[PDB]
Amino acid sequence: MGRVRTKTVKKAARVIIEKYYTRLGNDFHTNKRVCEEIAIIPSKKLRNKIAGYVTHLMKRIQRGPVRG
Amino acid sequence: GHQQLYWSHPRKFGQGSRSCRVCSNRHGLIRKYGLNMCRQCFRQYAKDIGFIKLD
Amino acid sequence: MAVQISKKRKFVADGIFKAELNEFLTRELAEDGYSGVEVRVTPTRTEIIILATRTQNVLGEKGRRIRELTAVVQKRFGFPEGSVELYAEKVATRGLCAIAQAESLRYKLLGGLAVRRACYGVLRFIMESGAKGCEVVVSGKLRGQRAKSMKFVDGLMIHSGDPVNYYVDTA
Amino acid sequence: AIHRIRITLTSRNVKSLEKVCADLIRGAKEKNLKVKGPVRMPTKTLRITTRKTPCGEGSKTWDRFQMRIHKRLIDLHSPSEIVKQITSISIEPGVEVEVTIADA
Amino acid sequence: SKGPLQSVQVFGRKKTATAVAHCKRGNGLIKVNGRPLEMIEPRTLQYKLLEPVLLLGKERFAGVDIRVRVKGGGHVAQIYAIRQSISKALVAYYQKYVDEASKKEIKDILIQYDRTLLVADPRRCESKKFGGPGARARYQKSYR
Amino acid sequence: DIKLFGKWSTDDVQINDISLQDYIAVKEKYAKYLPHSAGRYAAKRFRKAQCPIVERLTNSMMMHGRNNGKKLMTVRIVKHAFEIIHLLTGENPLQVLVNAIINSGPREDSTRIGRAGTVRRQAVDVSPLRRVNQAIWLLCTGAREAAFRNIKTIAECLADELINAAKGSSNSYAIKKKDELERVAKSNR
Amino acid sequence: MSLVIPEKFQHILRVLNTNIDGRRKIAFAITAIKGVGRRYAHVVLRKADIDLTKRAGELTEDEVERVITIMQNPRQYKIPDWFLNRQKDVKDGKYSQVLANGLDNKLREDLERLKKIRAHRGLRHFWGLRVRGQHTKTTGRRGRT
Amino acid sequence: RDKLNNLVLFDKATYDKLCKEVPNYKLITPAVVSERLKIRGSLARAALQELLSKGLIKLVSKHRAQVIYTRNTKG
Amino acid sequence: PGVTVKDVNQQEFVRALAAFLKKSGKLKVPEWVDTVKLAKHKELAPYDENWFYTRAASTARHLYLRGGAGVGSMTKIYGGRQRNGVMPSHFSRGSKSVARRVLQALEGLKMVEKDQDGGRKLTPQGQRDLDRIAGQVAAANKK
RNA sequence: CCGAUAACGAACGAGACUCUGGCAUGCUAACUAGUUACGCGACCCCCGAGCGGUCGGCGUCCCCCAACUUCUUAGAGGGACAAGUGGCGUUCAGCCACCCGAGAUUGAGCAAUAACAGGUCUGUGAUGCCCUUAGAUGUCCGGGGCUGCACGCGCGCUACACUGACUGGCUCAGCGUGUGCCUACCCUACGCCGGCAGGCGCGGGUAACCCGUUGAACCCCAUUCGUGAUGGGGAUCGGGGAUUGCAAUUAUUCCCCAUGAACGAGGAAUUCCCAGUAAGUGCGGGUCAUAAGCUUGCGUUGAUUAAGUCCCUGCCCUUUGUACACACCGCC
Ligand SMILES: [Mg+2]
Ligand SMILES: [Mg+2]
């Protein structure tokens, strides 16, 4: 248990998906690489958390719209 | 009194020989690494010395 | 080797010298807004820099006070003659120096200003010099047996984790 | 010459120690001196565990103060002299050098 | 017939005990610290030492010469480091010098018997805390 | 083929009760040369189900303080006891152990919190993993109590405990404790 | 050889002034005498040259008296000076080993000399308190109540 | 159950019992023979190794903390 | 099929070498071997009368395994647990004089010699003695 | 956090963070770490093995006289994200399992608004007021005391035994310290004397250079003991011998020989704990001239049970009542 995400990663995931939907895709490693230059994330441990939530949200987006 | 008994006590060792290099206290002395600093004066000056709490 | 002391004791002793020098300079130059001491040590000579708010005060008439301090720090620490140099440097953005603002607050309260006035002036000066936030506490007894603590905050202020060490200046 | 120098760098902060070693190797390589790789001595951890309280009353909490000392070795072995080629050391506060000849 | 440079060197560790198996071309012979696999103490767990050869077969080992040096931990940790180094040494040797069909058809046997022959144990220890004798046990407290 | 302790083949041992078939681990997949492995069997729930039962026995036989980590000593004790029961009964020690576990595991129990009449209020039927746990615990405690203040060694006391439990003869500590516990559940049904 | 009990086997002996059980081993059997313990018993048996594996009950009279005289005269039987009880006596200065009710009476003599000279240890023994300077605050209450 | 007072040396009535029925049952250990014939146990080990050397009993284990013997096969 | 000492059970090897030293009688044995204890933490003297031969074999084997060992190294090897009565246990060394007398007997047997540095190592005579004893005990183990 | 939604957008704390552990046969490297290969030896070999085996034997930065970083060290980069699959879920937040994987919850440190007349004036050249200040409550010196014992309590250590004790042999660590401003006091190798405690010379080490390949204990393998307050236990006490110190008595500590007390698993009650964990088991630091049954760390061996609940004990949130608000230690 204890894998619930935080506002700090969720806000960033929504924002970068909105800004760079065209650049980004549904591959985790591709997303964790594009984030490295589209955002100055101080921490790798937070960067890949953001990337994981980004992949989850984009997999959702391919099916149906969300609040973002 | 006079010269031959005022400081005549053998003080080459023990608690009484060593003292705090800061506040001249004889309790809680930290002699590791040649600190010669009090248990409390060390907590005061550890940041200046260079000791950092990591874990 | 035999004459030299081990590296561990050497670094501990160097830190000891830093602490004692800082405390002596604090007590001596407290009324001149002494911010801190930075010591550059080379194997040949020792260079020390007194970061202060008022260089014109820390160095006396014709530099009398600074050369007097140089003699003092020679005598205490056994430095050979002409092997240590004392410089005085003005602190940049003194409003961001926790020690300097605490010293000015002490000077105001010693003068006898109301703590609310003095603390709010310090808050305004810090925020005017530009900071994410600041926080002052005055605790103790004034005119009464029962002691009170008064706290004045503004802006952001982080407390926990590693970032506090190099984000928050404390005094 | 024939001379071989061992320079030891000792400090507390790895960032400045790595800088003051790397610029030494980088400077000497341009001057074409045979520089053996910077040997990393095992770091020395001075650990002091002290009661947090200044009185004695409490829940017996302890502070684990740690002081880490990092040490690097750099060997310059040129066929010709070395002292005349290297007269600057480019130090920053905190790091301490110690010159040594290979005889020692 | 005399092809040199045919040797690998593989380590295996468990609880601060590291063993280095030097797998080299030659006749079948396994020695740890200059001694054969038998007579290594404790004599209990000798089957644990022998389990690599017992499962995969003596014939496969007949083409290699194994010398293991181990300098850590305690007795059982030495045993586990030795067996892990032995089991990983020849599978790496096979991966490097023959086809990986052989490597997979040996490593599947090893992995279905016990995963620890090829995968090190990731657990080491836990620090002691200042409220009790061990890592988690706390000193007995009294109320009256 | 596996040759636990170099002998005592595993493929001839059957678990006759389906209720315990998938928790006893003497089959060929769980068969092992020695009753010793740092397998992290307490990593999560039900991980001990796939743990070999001889390993579980040698892990439960190290108890009562003076010997908590002495797995090598417990392994040699299990070795000697298995050899003794093989030469004493004439069948596989593994089959003896499996039947002992089956007969030792108390099929029921009782548990509440309210004002108990005799021992405990509500009868209940236990889980198979609880069957294995309590059977191993009862057998180990019986052997330990038998070999406390007599000349008879741990290996011999464990041996006769398993031998008596495998058939049911009212003198085994595990069987007696199971009988008492089943009786109190029956009375407090 | 572990054959049957010898005819001249005594279940209990009587050496010096106190009986010893011969059913146990000889070395651990003569330790029942006051003044002689495991180390002294083993060393006197080494000097007496008797089979250590044999029981005390099957010892014969000449071997028993040989062991007796060995343990009674250690100074003349190579036994080192640092192995005896009463080394360098506070009374006569002769190194000796005491192995009888002589031990009890030497103990009361050494207690009563301190009591007579009013030494602190003598006073403590007279009062029944601890004598080696340990704390009596929370221990030794069993001997009092 | 007060005391055992087991014998420390053999006699005529027990030595013949040891020679007649000890090599007749499968499990023979020093503890078993001690509690069976009221012998101490040092005698048990010594006499069992004597019968082992004489050949009427076969050793199987030979371990320090526990040594196990057996009767000879029949037929 | 040569045999080195490291190819056989050391526990039986040291016993066989002790028997060899006992049968070939020239090793010097101090007159107090029947009296002293082997170590400070030992409550009794060793049961075996030829503990000197056993210890001589053991120290020869250890010197074969690693050289440069002195009295301080030998006493560390043979040290063990001290129970200290009601105090909790600690670790204690052996008997310095016992180890030194044994090593002096070994060099009187002329199979142990002083090193170029401190400590002692094995002569080729001792090497050949040890390895031939190893070969014979290996043959005995085989058959 | 998601959702509901007169709220929307945030901030502190949580998280994030730093350190530590787990993986990189990938990078940079190393005579203060080494490893392979090779050369001299030393031995078993001779049946002959001969690119045979062992060597912490000596060497190949003795710098011209091999390479390499796998093992070791320490830097930068990577790697793990509920990422992949199935199931459950508003199909959201997430949860369960499995695969690949070194790892699918490694431990700590830091830590809010505040409150506790909580503890410390015996930490301080932190400090108000009071007290004393020459027959001193200053300071020094001598001795004693802090240990003192009908008794009660707390943290503990050792045991009650054969799953053991003794004797011998075999065999494995990691933290970490080490010669001093004052300051007198370091870790110890090697050889010799003694049985031990110890003593005497001769070095090395200011340290990955020496102790040290830390030959630790438990454990493992053999001997004896044999259910007996017994070869378990070593409490109490006698005698002797050493060490430190100016000084050992009220025994500092250590060693040796003697007596051998309760104790045969412990009432009512009660403590701690979920994986390298409990527990067994030793080794360092601090204290230290001498001192560990303490504490702080480290390593070795290594489990049983549980993946839940509010029954007990507490704490928190919401509703509620209030004559309390110095707030129930209230008011009256
Ligand atoms: Mg945090
Ligand atoms: Mg005594």
Side-chain angles (χ1 to χ4, degrees):
Chain A
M1 304 94 75
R3 322 271 281 175
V4 180
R5 277 65 167 261
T6 309
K7 292 186 304 285
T8 318
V9 308
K10 290 203 192 251
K11 300 283 197 298
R14 272 70 167 271
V15 171
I16 64 184
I17 288 169
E18 290 164 348
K19 300 293 181 184
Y20 292 100
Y21 179 55
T22 68
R23 308 256 301 274
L24 274 52
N26 65 304
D27 185 21
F28 171 77
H29 304 288
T30 305
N31 295 356
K32 90 188 178 177
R33 294 299 171 180
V34 297
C35 289
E36 289 174 358
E37 78 258 10
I38 70 174
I40 44 171
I41 301 183
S43 169
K44 162 164 51 148
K45 181 150 203 291
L46 185 134
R47 172 259 285 160
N48 48 15
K49 282 204 204 191
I50 281 182
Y53 195 49
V54 157
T55 69
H56 199 58
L57 288 184
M58 276 194 177
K59 196 167 179 177
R60 282 275 292 291
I61 287 299
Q62 193 207 298
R63 280 202 281 97
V66 304
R67 312 310 207 96
Chain B
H2 71 298
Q3 322 303 97
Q4 270 80 26
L5 81 165
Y6 182 42
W7 205 236
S8 61
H9 199 297
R11 254 192 267 283
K12 273 80 196 163
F13 53 80
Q15 299 191 70
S17 58
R18 300 169 264 109
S19 45
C20 204
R21 71 181 313 136
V22 178
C23 66
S24 307
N25 199 22
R26 311 199 181 283
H27 292 268
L29 260 291
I30 295 172
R31 311 156 58 186
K32 206 152 164 212
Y33 316 121
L35 262 174
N36 300 115
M37 192 174 280
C38 284
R39 163 163 83 85
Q40 293 93 359
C41 301
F42 174 74
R43 286 200 75 250
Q44 181 180 355
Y45 291 106
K47 279 290 293 315
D48 303 293
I49 292 155
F51 284 87
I52 302 302
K53 210 180 315 195
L54 274 304
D55 57 2
Chain C
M1 56 84 71
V3 177
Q4 293 261 56
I5 315 298
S6 64
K7 286 301 177 178
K8 306 150 75 163
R9 282 175 95 102
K10 193 261 289 186
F11 272 90
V12 165
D14 293 350
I16 285 294
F17 157 70
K18 306 290 178 62
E20 166 159 327
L21 172 74
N22 164 75
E23 173 84 350
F24 156 64
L25 287 185
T26 287
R27 286 176 191 243
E28 178 59 27
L29 280 300
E31 277 78 21
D32 304 351
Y34 157 82
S35 296
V37 54
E38 158 61 29
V39 182
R40 313 182 159 239
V41 171
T42 76
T44 49
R45 78 186 185 190
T46 291
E47 187 175 354
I48 69 168
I49 318 159
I50 297 104
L51 275 175
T53 50
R54 308 278 201 237
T55 74
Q56 94 267 17
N57 201 1
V58 305
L59 64 92
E61 303 289 341
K62 315 279 288 184
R64 175 149 90 118
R65 196 169 177 178
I66 183 171
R67 65 168 65 87
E68 211 270 349
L69 280 175
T70 303
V72 158
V73 305
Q74 283 203 166
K75 299 214 154 48
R76 169 59 185 77
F77 306 98
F79 281 131
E81 317 299 283
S83 82
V84 65
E85 289 100 341
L86 275 65
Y87 302 151
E89 277 205 347
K90 213 163 286 298
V91 55
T93 179
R94 57 163 166 164
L96 290 180
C97 173
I99 307 194
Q101 299 305 287
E103 149 68 15
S104 74
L105 195 47
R106 168 166 67 191
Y107 169 74
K108 281 159 176 241
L109 300 190
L110 277 189
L113 209 67
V115 305
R116 201 170 292 234
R117 287 176 73 187
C119 287
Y120 267 111
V122 168
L123 269 287
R124 293 182 179 94
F125 189 42
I126 292 167
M127 277 299 187
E128 188 253 337
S129 51
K132 317 189 78 146
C134 66
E135 181 265 0
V136 305
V137 186
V138 167
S139 180
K141 43 176 307 188
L142 281 176
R143 282 177 189 228
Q145 293 296 81
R146 202 51 165 100
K148 199 178 58 180
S149 70
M150 286 191 64
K151 179 166 175 167
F152 312 90
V153 302
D154 58 3
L156 260 65
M157 165 67 50
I158 64 172
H159 301 78
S160 74
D162 186 29
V164 75
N165 295 309
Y166 66 111
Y167 285 161
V168 167
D169 207 5
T170 55
Chain D
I2 317 296
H3 277 96
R4 292 176 54 232
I5 182 170
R6 160 89 56 80
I7 179 66
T8 177
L9 281 298
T10 307
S11 89
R12 305 214 309 273
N13 53 333
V14 190
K15 312 307 260 164
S16 75
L17 196 57
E18 202 266 357
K19 173 66 180 75
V20 78
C21 290
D23 70 336
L24 194 55
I25 285 94
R26 195 177 37 77
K29 283 289 286 182
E30 309 179 306
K31 277 72 177 175
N32 306 115
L33 272 81
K34 194 70 59 70
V35 181
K36 299 306 291 184
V39 190
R40 283 86 196 275
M41 285 305 174
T43 74
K44 298 286 97 177
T45 307
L46 321 183
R47 185 167 286 100
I48 297 179
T49 57
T50 320
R51 273 295 281 282
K52 286 192 188 181
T53 183
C55 165
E57 183 267 338
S59 200
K60 278 80 173 171
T61 62
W62 298 75
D63 272 321
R64 329 204 175 83
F65 294 95
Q66 274 207 31
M67 188 179 198
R68 297 186 186 180
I69 315 154
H70 318 276
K71 186 169 160 244
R72 309 264 170 278
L73 284 196
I74 297 161
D75 277 300
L76 281 83
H77 306 335
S78 81
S80 300
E81 194 55 40
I82 43 183
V83 180
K84 277 79 176 181
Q85 285 76 13
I86 299 98
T87 53
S88 63
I89 47 177
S90 60
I91 322 291
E92 61 261 19
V95 185
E96 180 256 359
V97 299
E98 168 71 27
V99 58
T100 304
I101 316 165
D103 300 345
Chain E
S1 86
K2 265 166 52 171
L5 276 151
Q6 186 152 348
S7 183
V8 306
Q9 211 157 6
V10 173
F11 70 88
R13 72 184 64 251
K14 177 179 186 295
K15 286 167 79 178
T16 79
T18 176
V20 172
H22 184 240
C23 183
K24 192 175 67 174
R25 187 174 195 171
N27 291 305
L29 177 135
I30 302 188
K31 290 206 191 247
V32 294
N33 284 352
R35 314 162 193 232
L37 269 173
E38 297 312 273
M39 287 72 73
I40 284 301
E41 308 298 331
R43 207 173 303 108
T44 320
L45 307 164
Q46 267 189 358
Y47 289 90
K48 263 281 199 205
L49 280 81
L50 295 166
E51 265 179 2
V53 309
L54 301 165
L55 271 82
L56 70 95
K58 189 183 189 300
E59 290 307 310
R60 315 193 182 159
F61 265 101
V64 290
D65 195 357
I66 301 304
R67 299 201 220 280
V68 184
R69 47 177 161 89
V70 61
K71 198 165 273 297
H75 296 146
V76 192
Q78 293 286 100
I79 297 314
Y80 274 72
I82 281 162
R83 65 198 288 279
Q84 188 171 124
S85 301
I86 284 172
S87 51
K88 275 194 286 192
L90 80 163
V91 305
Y93 182 89
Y94 276 28
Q95 200 268 355
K96 192 180 171 183
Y97 291 121
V98 295
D99 55 8
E100 291 90 7
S102 189
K103 187 203 51 173
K104 63 166 172 279
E105 69 97 24
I106 183 178
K107 83 189 296 182
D108 66 333
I109 301 303
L110 269 77
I111 202 69
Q112 69 91 24
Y113 191 66
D114 191 353
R115 193 191 154 76
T116 60
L117 279 80
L118 259 59
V119 169
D121 202 18
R123 49 182 183 174
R124 307 278 153 162
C125 280
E126 208 173 305
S127 305
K128 172 200 177 311
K129 275 72 173 181
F130 52 79
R136 283 170 203 260
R138 309 290 91 193
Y139 286 130
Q140 172 154 350
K141 73 187 292 184
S142 70
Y143 295 104
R144 270 73 189 255
Chain F
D1 209 325
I2 288 297
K3 306 296 111 181
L4 170 62
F5 281 136
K7 54 189 96 79
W8 301 322
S9 82
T10 69
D11 59 359
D12 71 334
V13 172
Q14 60 167 354
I15 311 102
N16 56 5
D17 49 2
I18 182 171
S19 48
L20 277 300
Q21 265 178 3
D22 60 350
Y23 282 92
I24 308 297
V26 288
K27 290 286 102 177
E28 87 271 10
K29 190 178 84 74
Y30 306 119
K32 187 163 51 181
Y33 265 96
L34 301 171
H36 177 283
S37 183
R40 283 90 69 74
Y41 290 131
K44 57 176 62 66
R45 194 167 180 217
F46 296 123
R47 179 53 48 87
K48 62 182 70 170
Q50 61 95 13
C51 169
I53 68 154
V54 56
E55 162 73 37
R56 293 264 297 278
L57 174 61
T58 201
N59 272 16
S60 175
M61 202 61 207
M62 46 169 83
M63 272 194 37
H64 278 52
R66 69 158 82 98
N67 52 9
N68 278 115
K70 304 172 166 72
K71 200 158 172 189
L72 278 76
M73 182 253 280
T74 317
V75 162
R76 85 163 155 76
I77 282 184
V78 158
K79 181 178 177 69
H80 298 322
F82 272 175
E83 169 65 30
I84 279 175
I85 70 175
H86 171 39
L87 63 88
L88 183 44
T89 68
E91 65 261 23
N92 211 305
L94 310 179
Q95 193 70 86
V96 175
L97 172 71
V98 166
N99 284 65
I101 290 304
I102 286 161
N103 297 346
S104 291
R107 283 178 321 278
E108 281 191 351
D109 212 354
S110 55
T111 173
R112 292 301 290 181
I113 304 168
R115 192 78 270 172
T118 297
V119 170
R120 196 72 95 186
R121 292 290 278 171
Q122 183 64 54
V124 76
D125 55 310
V126 314
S127 194
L129 200 50
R130 188 48 191 279
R131 284 277 296 279
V132 187
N133 290 11
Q134 195 61 29
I136 296 176
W137 188 88
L138 282 177
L139 287 172
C140 278
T141 51
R144 171 162 30 247
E145 282 287 336
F148 185 39
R149 308 265 319 287
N150 59 2
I151 194 66
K152 187 181 204 158
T153 58
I154 302 285
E156 309 169 17
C157 284
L158 180 64
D160 64 67
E161 191 75 26
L162 268 74
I163 286 156
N164 298 339
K167 58 191 194 296
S169 61
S170 181
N171 73 335
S172 160
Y173 176 86
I175 306 305
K176 286 191 285 190
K177 292 310 290 194
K178 171 191 174 180
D179 296 332
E180 170 82 358
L181 190 150
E182 294 268 15
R183 181 186 62 78
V184 304
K186 181 77 165 179
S187 166
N188 275 312
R189 282 277 302 277
Chain G
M1 198 46 150
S2 296
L3 264 291
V4 302
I5 173 172
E7 269 81 12
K8 326 178 313 304
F9 189 97
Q10 305 89 9
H11 300 82
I12 51 163
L13 312 183
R14 182 51 167 266
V15 297
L16 304 182
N17 276 343
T18 172
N19 48 68
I20 60 181
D21 193 15
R23 303 196 314 189
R24 46 181 59 226
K25 305 277 268 207
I26 179 66
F28 296 94
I30 57 172
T31 53
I33 299 169
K34 311 293 180 289
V36 55
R38 308 169 187 270
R39 283 273 291 144
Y40 203 75
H42 273 76
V43 73
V44 300
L45 260 50
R46 302 293 160 86
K47 290 303 296 173
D49 284 332
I50 181 59
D51 209 336
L52 288 181
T53 197
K54 87 201 299 177
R55 297 290 171 182
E58 51 187 351
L59 263 294
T60 53
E61 77 264 47
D62 57 348
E63 314 176 307
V64 164
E65 63 91 19
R66 179 174 49 232
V67 169
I68 285 290
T69 181
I70 285 282
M71 81 181 197
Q72 285 262 337
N73 274 28
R75 295 293 317 286
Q76 297 90 1
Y77 269 121
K78 198 261 295 179
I79 299 300
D81 215 10
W82 45 264
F83 209 81
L84 322 178
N85 283 355
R86 186 71 71 165
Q87 316 176 20
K88 189 174 177 291
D89 205 324
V90 77
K91 158 75 203 88
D92 48 31
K94 52 160 48 64
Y95 302 81
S96 71
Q97 171 71 263
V98 181
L99 314 94
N101 57 2
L103 189 72
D104 310 331
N105 57 57
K106 288 300 285 188
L107 176 51
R108 55 86 183 158
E109 150 73 18
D110 203 82
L111 197 143
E112 77 172 350
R113 62 174 292 261
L114 300 157
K115 175 62 175 66
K116 184 181 176 70
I117 69 187
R118 311 296 300 161
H120 195 173
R121 277 147 51 80
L123 313 189
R124 291 306 288 263
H125 272 301
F126 184 55
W127 302 322
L129 308 170
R130 298 286 152 103
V131 310
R132 300 189 199 275
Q134 57 260 31
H135 293 193
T136 48
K137 203 187 190 257
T138 49
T139 47
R141 298 182 187 172
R142 151 173 296 279
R144 294 303 189 183
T145 60
Chain H
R1 190 66 177 92
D2 51 352
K3 262 179 87 178
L4 262 63
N5 59 57
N6 283 349
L7 55 92
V8 72
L9 268 180
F10 263 117
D11 47 40
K12 182 59 193 84
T14 310
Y15 193 38
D16 63 339
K17 190 81 164 295
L18 171 88
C19 299
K20 78 185 284 288
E21 89 168 14
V22 160
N24 260 339
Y25 51 95
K26 297 176 262 300
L27 179 63
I28 178 66
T29 70
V32 159
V33 61
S34 160
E35 74 195 9
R36 191 157 306 279
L37 310 183
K38 312 301 297 310
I39 65 187
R40 200 165 265 244
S42 56
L43 295 189
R45 291 198 269 102
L48 264 295
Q49 85 199 355
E50 285 302 321
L51 275 73
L52 170 76
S53 54
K54 289 178 180 167
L56 296 90
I57 286 179
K58 178 189 299 306
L59 176 144
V60 287
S61 75
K62 186 40 96 167
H63 184 271
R64 150 201 71 98
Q66 177 55 70
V67 53
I68 315 165
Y69 298 96
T70 191
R71 80 208 176 154
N72 300 144
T73 47
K74 247 73 176 177
Chain I
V3 162
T4 312
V5 62
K6 296 184 178 189
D7 309 334
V8 71
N9 185 252
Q10 310 289 295
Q11 185 156 0
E12 166 59 34
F13 167 81
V14 68
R15 173 168 287 103
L17 174 61
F20 165 85
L21 295 192
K22 178 84 184 310
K23 67 101 177 177
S24 58
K26 87 183 77 168
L27 197 146
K28 176 57 188 46
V29 167
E31 74 274 351
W32 39 254
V33 288
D34 55 4
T35 314
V36 309
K37 318 195 281 186
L38 278 196
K40 176 174 74 180
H41 57 267
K42 294 291 164 58
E43 198 271 330
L44 301 178
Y47 296 164
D48 203 296
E49 299 290 330
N50 315 130
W51 66 258
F52 209 83
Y53 296 92
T54 291
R55 168 65 56 102
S58 171
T59 180
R61 207 198 51 82
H62 275 286
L63 281 186
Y64 195 97
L65 290 204
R66 48 183 290 173
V71 190
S73 296
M74 283 298 124
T75 192
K76 270 183 61 178
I77 293 176
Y78 298 112
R81 180 165 82 166
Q82 191 169 0
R83 299 182 78 248
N84 284 325
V86 74
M87 300 285 287
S89 156
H90 282 317
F91 167 77
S92 175
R93 308 268 193 87
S95 167
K96 265 199 281 189
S97 282
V98 161
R100 188 185 57 250
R101 280 311 196 248
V102 169
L103 271 171
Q104 281 171 309
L106 265 286
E107 54 186 353
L109 196 58
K110 266 80 173 175
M111 54 165 55
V112 165
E113 87 272 25
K114 297 281 181 72
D115 272 341
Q116 65 257 7
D117 77 313
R120 274 78 64 89
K121 81 185 297 290
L122 291 193
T123 76
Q125 195 263 356
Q127 201 159 334
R128 78 159 295 191
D129 289 320
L130 283 165
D131 271 11
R132 281 180 288 109
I133 291 289
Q136 79 188 50
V137 70
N141 197 353
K142 177 55 67 195
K143 296 285 98 176

